[PDB]
Amino acid sequence: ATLKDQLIYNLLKEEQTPQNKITVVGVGAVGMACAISILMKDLADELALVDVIEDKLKGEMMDLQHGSLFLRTPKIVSGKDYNVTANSKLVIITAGANLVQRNVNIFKFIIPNVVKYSPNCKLLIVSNPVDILTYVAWKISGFPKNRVIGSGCNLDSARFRYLMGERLGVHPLSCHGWVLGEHGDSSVPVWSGMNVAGVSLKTLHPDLGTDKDKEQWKEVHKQVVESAYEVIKLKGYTSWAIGLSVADLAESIMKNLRRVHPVSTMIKGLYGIKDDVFLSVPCILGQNGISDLVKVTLTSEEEARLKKSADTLWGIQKELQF
Amino acid sequence: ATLKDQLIYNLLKEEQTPQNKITVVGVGAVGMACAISILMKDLADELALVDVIEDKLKGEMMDLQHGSLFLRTPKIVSGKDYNVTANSKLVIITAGASRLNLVQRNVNIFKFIIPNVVKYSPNCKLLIVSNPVDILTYVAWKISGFPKNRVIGSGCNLDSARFRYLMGERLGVHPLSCHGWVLGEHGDSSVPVWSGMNVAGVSLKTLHPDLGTDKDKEQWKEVHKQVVESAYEVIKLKGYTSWAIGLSVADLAESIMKNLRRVHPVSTMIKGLYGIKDDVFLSVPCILGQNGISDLVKVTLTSEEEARLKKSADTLWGIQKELQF
Amino acid sequence: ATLKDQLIYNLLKEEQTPQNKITVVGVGAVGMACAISILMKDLADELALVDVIEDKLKGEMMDLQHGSLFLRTPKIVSGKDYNVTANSKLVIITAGASRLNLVQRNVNIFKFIIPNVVKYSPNCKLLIVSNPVDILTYVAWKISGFPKNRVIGSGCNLDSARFRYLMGERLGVHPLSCHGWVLGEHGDSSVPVWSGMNVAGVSLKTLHPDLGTDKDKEQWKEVHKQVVESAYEVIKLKGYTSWAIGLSVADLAESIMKNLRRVHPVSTMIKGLYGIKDDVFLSVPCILGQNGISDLVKVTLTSEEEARLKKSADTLWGIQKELQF
Amino acid sequence: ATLKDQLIYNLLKEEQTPQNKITVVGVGAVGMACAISILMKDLADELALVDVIEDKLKGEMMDLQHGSLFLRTPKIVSGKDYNVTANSKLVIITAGAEGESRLNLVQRNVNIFKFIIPNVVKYSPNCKLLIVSNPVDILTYVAWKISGFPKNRVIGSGCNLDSARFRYLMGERLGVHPLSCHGWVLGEHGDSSVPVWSGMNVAGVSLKTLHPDLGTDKDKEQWKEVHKQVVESAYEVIKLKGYTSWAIGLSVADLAESIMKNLRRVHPVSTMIKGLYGIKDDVFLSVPCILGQNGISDLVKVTLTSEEEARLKKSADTLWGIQKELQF
Ligand SMILES: NC(=O)C1=CN([C@@H]2O[C@H](COP(=O)(O)OP(=O)(O)OC[C@H]3O[C@@H](n4cnc5c(N)ncnc54)[C@H](O)[C@@H]3O)[C@@H](O)[C@H]2O)C=CC1
Ligand SMILES: NC(=O)C1=CN([C@@H]2O[C@H](COP(=O)(O)OP(=O)(O)OC[C@H]3O[C@@H](n4cnc5c(N)ncnc54)[C@H](O)[C@@H]3O)[C@@H](O)[C@H]2O)C=CC1
Ligand SMILES: NC(=O)C1=CN([C@@H]2O[C@H](COP(=O)(O)OP(=O)(O)OC[C@H]3O[C@@H](n4cnc5c(N)ncnc54)[C@H](O)[C@@H]3O)[C@@H](O)[C@H]2O)C=CC1
Ligand SMILES: NC(=O)C1=CN([C@@H]2O[C@H](COP(=O)(O)OP(=O)(O)OC[C@H]3O[C@@H](n4cnc5c(N)ncnc54)[C@H](O)[C@@H]3O)[C@@H](O)[C@H]2O)C=CC1
Ligand SMILES: Nc1cccc([C@@]2(c3ccsc3)CC(O)=C(Sc3ccccc3Cl)C(=O)O2)c1
Numbered sequence A: 001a002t003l004k005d006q007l008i009y010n011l012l013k014e015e016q017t018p019q020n021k022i023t024v025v026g027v028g029a030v031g032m033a034c035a036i037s038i039l040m041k042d043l044a045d046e047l048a049l050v051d052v053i054e055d056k057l058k059g060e061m062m063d064l065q066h067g068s069l070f071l072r073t074p075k076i077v078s079g080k081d082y083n084v085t086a087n088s089k090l091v092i093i094t095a096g097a098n099l100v101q102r103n104v105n106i107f108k109f110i111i112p113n114v115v116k117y118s119p120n121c122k123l124l125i126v127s128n129p130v131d132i133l134t135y136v137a138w139k140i141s142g143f144p145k146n147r148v149i150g151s152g153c154n155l156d157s158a159r160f161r162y163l164m165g166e167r168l169g170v171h172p173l174s175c176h177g178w179v180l181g182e183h184g185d186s187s188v189p190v191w192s193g194m195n196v197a198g199v200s201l202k203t204l205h206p207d208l209g210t211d212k213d214k215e216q217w218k219e220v221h222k223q224v225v226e227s228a229y230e231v232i233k234l235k236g237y238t239s240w241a242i243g244l245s246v247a248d249l250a251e252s253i254m255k256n257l258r259r260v261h262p263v264s265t266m267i268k269g270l271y272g273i274k275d276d277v278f279l280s281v282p283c284i285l286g287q288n289g290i291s292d293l294v295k296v297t298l299t300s301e302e303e304a305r306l307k308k309s310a311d312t313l314w315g316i317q318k319e320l321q322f
Numbered sequence B, C: 001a002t003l004k005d006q007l008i009y010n011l012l013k014e015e016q017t018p019q020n021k022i023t024v025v026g027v028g029a030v031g032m033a034c035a036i037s038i039l040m041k042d043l044a045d046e047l048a049l050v051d052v053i054e055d056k057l058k059g060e061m062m063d064l065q066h067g068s069l070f071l072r073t074p075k076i077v078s079g080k081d082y083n084v085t086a087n088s089k090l091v092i093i094t095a096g097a098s099r100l101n102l103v104q105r106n107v108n109i110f111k112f113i114i115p116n117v118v119k120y121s122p123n124c125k126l127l128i129v130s131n132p133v134d135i136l137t138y139v140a141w142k143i144s145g146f147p148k149n150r151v152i153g154s155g156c157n158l159d160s161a162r163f164r165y166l167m168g169e170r171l172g173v174h175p176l177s178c179h180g181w182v183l184g185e186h187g188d189s190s191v192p193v194w195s196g197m198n199v200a201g202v203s204l205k206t207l208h209p210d211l212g213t214d215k216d217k218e219q220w221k222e223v224h225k226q227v228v229e230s231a232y233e234v235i236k237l238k239g240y241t242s243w244a245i246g247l248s249v250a251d252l253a254e255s256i257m258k259n260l261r262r263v264h265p266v267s268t269m270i271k272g273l274y275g276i277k278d279d280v281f282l283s284v285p286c287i288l289g290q291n292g293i294s295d296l297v298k299v300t301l302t303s304e305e306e307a308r309l310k311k312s313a314d315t316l317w318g319i320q321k322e323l324q325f
Numbered sequence D: 001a002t003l004k005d006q007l008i009y010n011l012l013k014e015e016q017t018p019q020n021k022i023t024v025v026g027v028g029a030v031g032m033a034c035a036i037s038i039l040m041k042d043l044a045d046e047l048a049l050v051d052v053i054e055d056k057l058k059g060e061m062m063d064l065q066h067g068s069l070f071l072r073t074p075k076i077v078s079g080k081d082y083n084v085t086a087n088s089k090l091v092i093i094t095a096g097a098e099g100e101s102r103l104n105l106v107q108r109n110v111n112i113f114k115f116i117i118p119n120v121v122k123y124s125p126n127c128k129l130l131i132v133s134n135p136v137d138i139l140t141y142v143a144w145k146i147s148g149f150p151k152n153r154v155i156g157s158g159c160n161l162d163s164a165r166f167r168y169l170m171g172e173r174l175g176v177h178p179l180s181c182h183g184w185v186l187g188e189h190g191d192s193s194v195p196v197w198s199g200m201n202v203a204g205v206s207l208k209t210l211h212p213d214l215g216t217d218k219d220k221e222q223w224k225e226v227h228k229q230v231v232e233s234a235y236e237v238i239k240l241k242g243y244t245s246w247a248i249g250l251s252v253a254d255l256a257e258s259i260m261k262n263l264r265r266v267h268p269v270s271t272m273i274k275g276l277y278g279i280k281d282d283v284f285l286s287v288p289c290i291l292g293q294n295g296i297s298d299l300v301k302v303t304l305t306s307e308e309e310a311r312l313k314k315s316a317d318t319l320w321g322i323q324k325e326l327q328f
């Protein structure tokens, strides 16, 4: 008899399926930071990694497996073939190649393959331009709107709260503030909702977020955009902050928490938007993905900025060939 | 008054010393993996990062700070100057660069780092990750002037973790329940201690006396060979290794910061054991806590195992006695 | 020689002291729920338990110690003598029993406890849970002689947590995303701050102007009424409350031990606010960290809310001025 | 429109069948310690509590729900009716029943299980059953017989706590964390448990090899006292506080973690041992078992000395003696 058979008596060999499986597509700095953060948060019983660069993919999988002793995710798998992703509860897309067209072409291959092996999964899109690519994943997959989630303004809001926390000398967890709309350069800081312990900063300081503000709090949102380009300039890419923010969304979904996050969802029917566009609003996240969304009261200016983003996104999206 | 003063009334300005500070020196793939793993394990109330590449260092610090909302480490700092590292409980060194020439280049790097670390955190524990780890732990010990308990080498911690992963894969059991120790010199010359390999206290060697020999039909020696083979394979495939070392270092940091007194295979002063008479650092199971290595486990080794550690000690001392401090 | 000496070689026999010690005074249902929650959150390297009932105290300590394999707190100690509490960073008081006769009995208990706590941990933060919490936080502050930042009352922490649970149930949103503050005097006379009630920064009062009034067709005033009613209902149903308070106390302990600077509704010296001139403790949002309450949030209250806090401060002072120290 | 409808736009009202649900039957000190430990370890997305004392059950549920802000288990439910337990992955039985007969107390607990087990099976036919109620070895057998479940899905807490206490005591003597002190207590849970001296080690270094007198009466250091103290400790906690709760709750949550997360870690739990150590009867005894999503998929075959083998066989004979007389 083998040493294994001498040591262990088997009761049954019955075929089993993962109960809390997560797949990460694209093993670049973003995908790998998502992976390590998900692993250290014990959110999955199985992690699958997919990429087109086979050697890097194998190396990344092996490196994570070598740290198994320090984790509570018993199975880590990888492959170019999507059969490794079968029965995933959540599929995170961090894969990426004007730039719009080549990322749409990457999705044309990825999304049907994801849908084939995990037809009941929630899709979480991180790849940029995130608002266009969440629409692209929704269009290709044929999934209901609740199961197609864009990372959207989750990171923008996290950076905003970090900067707010630094100015006030308070932990970001206790500094509330929402950055909504189009992810990136065109995002909207909702000044009316910025508060500490339910105390509105705008009520205390009516000049908040205006050019007349002597303390120039508008700079806090300007620094959210500036910080992102600064990190790229300094280290060539960003990874840690996005990975942590994605694992926070993954936690709400995997644990059915029904916490509210600023993520990209199909906004048709709000703020005079009549087109099939995805923009960030506060969404309730759980086991069914986006089950509900918060209807934020926006000022005329804020509403106009979301409508302008929606018009620009639809302008690009109506010319898209699938 | 300012909006801050309108919103918040201050009771005291008194800002005390950080109580559970960790410093990571070198922000390459290894140091950053150590950093993220330490952050996600809530081991520090302050994290300091140091490197000579100023742009990369700032970018890495900012990227970690941007994830603050999702962490419980309220202060993340960085700088080329070691004043940012003041009052660290633990300092992790991952900085580094013919073989005697390569080691000498790391000695010259350590000649700059170690006095600067000692200046700002004289009571810290030093955790050496930089390769060749056994030699560089000796170098850090020699330069710092610290007692042996406060100078810890990552040593065979990763080698053992990989061994347990491979053992777990062969047996269909979680690595946490697969016990096995890889000791001695970190890397190619490490020693798998076959006598201690067990599941639930059941010795694999007692069940299978050929275990770890060339006459073994199942070739369990391949499990230790795969520990060394895997490391080169990861380098070939992605260019470096990061995740496994980062996780293993954070596991050591946890025992130290939380004074757990768990047993880990780390590099310590082995003079006085296995006929070793030279000032060399080799991995043995050590009890880790608030004062670093307080104790070590005296593993019963066979004549062959003892000879391999003695040969490693002789080779290490041969390189060490020629180094310029 | 001994088996221990054959197995383990000792490097140093250095006497060490805990770096993150927490003491719980009173091992009743509340005290023990605080201890298990603190243990499962890895907040302490040492946990000390104190009580006057010696058999129950020993039994509780042993029961916790027997679960050590599943915890990361290496030392659990207990005793009637306060020498077991020496060098505590945080001391949690859950000890205690006409309503006025009751207060004086708790004052008598505190006259023994507080000097003993101060003697062995002069630099600790005191966290008062025992009822009437606002009066007993004042009593602990007066007896200890500690600055106001190091005397914290559990106050409206639990009231706010229950409010957020009830708000969450009505809206179908996790309590973490349902923001609402219950301030002032803990218990029956607490104040729900309707203006701050929000989800994602969207004011419920702006959306529903009748919120918190008798005109309200949805009767949101019942949410605050149910916070008070729930507490008496749990007592009626199981005889005491433990789990919710223990979890809420461990959340405060986390901000203090980890120097998080998160904002919590806790009882603090409110003299100088809302026209209050007496030495009384009431709940306001406080920034909690390594120095206890370093700062407080100045909540804009309506004239009605301000009047309720002033009436509570007058009533608390009325009881306080008659206490014998 | 309601304030909720003004604030929130609903995408779908559809509620999925429970995905990672745990049920705790019996809300005494043991059940509630299991419940708080499971909650603080984020093992379940839904926790169900069942008991026959309706007021205490409601009070315990409400108390846990009031701490929701500090937890990541979004749904806590309770009831006397087992419809609240539907689709549980794992069902933990802690419900239990002045000097009566040995067979008398067992039959009282058997009567309770005759009501519980069919109700559990009705609403969660595919669950894993984890038995904590005493006498655990007999009651795991009873749950197995009544349920009709395959042996892999019926797990007894067994010697999990005995081993945890042993490792704590070993750790205290050696000045090492219990996580690094390895040692197995097997067989019959409680008074008749077997310390496996041959497997006692630190870093793979056998204590028995270093100290051949280990676990014998001639031992000058009396290491037998470490196992004697495991049994003595249990009675001492009962004498001092009236019951035990924290240690059992933590040990049960550790088993729940391996099952819910399919970890395949090895634990000393009670399993149907027929076919081992000359045991021919349908009895449950503790051996190291691999725990995962299908419950006990495998077991470790520990080499026992003649004396150790004899003690397990004597336990098996005693347990079968009681079981063959039980009225179902
Ligand atoms: N939405 C947000 O808040 C943030 C988004 N990002 C985005 O994340 C994306 C990725 O960032 P990086 O990891 O730094 O890029 P990267 O280029 O380093 O990694 C991308 C990976 O995708 C892979 N890939 C390409 N085509 C593929 C295919 N057909 N199937 C599977 N994998 C494929 C590549 O081989 C590559 O490994 C970018 O689009 C970036 O803009 C980054 C930070 C924040
Ligand atoms: N002992 C073990 O088990 C393992 C050790 N390693 C070792 O970790 C070390 C680092 O690995 P990588 O991060 O991939 O190398 P790396 O070259 O990518 O990073 C090294 C960093 O050290 C910095 N550095 C150089 N001189 C410095 C100085 N005087 N002060 C401060 N920083 C300085 C560099 O600028 C660089 O950022 C290597 O020596 C490697 O062999 C890696 C895996 C496992
Ligand atoms: N502020 C809040 O939000 C909440 C406060 N509470 C309060 O917590 C307190 C305790 O509750 P329980 O644990 O249920 O009461 P308990 O009576 O069961 O426990 C109190 C313990 O204090 C001990 N004790 C009495 N005198 C002592 C002394 N001089 N030194 C040390 N220990 C002494 C007792 O022996 C007893 O074990 C009560 O005052 C209760 O009102 C409970 C829930 C919430
Ligand atoms: N196996 C082990 O290692 C350990 C086992 N235990 C055992 O756990 C059991 C429970 O301990 P305690 O909580 O202290 O006892 P307890 O008497 O305080 O609690 C038992 C609960 O079961 C309930 N119950 C009774 N009949 C029921 C029924 N037909 N359906 C639902 N619930 C019912 C009771 O109402 C009661 O609330 C005991 O049998 C004890 O021996 C305790 C410690 C360790
Ligand atoms: N790994 C990687 C590679 C390329 C680009 C990036 C990017 C990037 C893009 C432009 S500047 C930084 C991708 C990306 O969307 C973000 S967030 C962000 C970007 C611009 C403004 C405001 C915010 Cl919050 C970000 O922080 O990083 C990351």
Ligand SMILES: Nc1cccc([C@@]2(c3ccsc3)CC(O)=C(Sc3ccccc3Cl)C(=O)O2)c1
Binding pocket: B029, B030, B131, B158, B159, B162, B186, B187, B188, B227, B228, B229, B231, B232, B235, B239, B240, B241, B242
């Ligand atoms: N990031 C980085 C860069 C260069 C070299 C390395 C290295 C490396 C060296 C040669 S092959 C891999 C450094 C290093 O010592 C290890 S562990 C290791 C190495 C060889 C054999 C057995 C073991 Cl356990 C390891 O895994 O990684 C890492």
Ligand SMILES: Nc1cccc([C@@]2(c3ccsc3)CC(O)=C(Sc3ccccc3Cl)C(=O)O2)c1
Binding pocket: C029, C030, C131, C158, C159, C160, C162, C186, C187, C188, C227, C228, C229, C231, C232, C234, C235, C239, C240, C241, C242
């Ligand atoms: N363990 C124990 C024993 C006796 C009394 C209590 C008490 C209690 C007191 C009066 S009614 C319930 C102690 C106590 O202050 C609380 S919180 C609370 C109490 C009353 C109203 C609103 C709130 Cl949020 C509470 O929930 O529980 C607990």
Ligand SMILES: Nc1cccc([C@@]2(c3ccsc3)CC(O)=C(Sc3ccccc3Cl)C(=O)O2)c1
Binding pocket: D029, D030, D134, D161, D162, D165, D189, D190, D191, D230, D231, D232, D234, D235, D237, D238, D242, D243, D244, D245
């Ligand atoms: N809650 C409660 C109520 C009554 C009895 C118990 C009991 C008890 C039984 C006899 S002495 C203590 C139930 C029980 O099995 C245990 S473990 C145990 C018991 C005896 C010896 C060795 C061990 Cl490890 C234990 O620790 O506690 C618990």
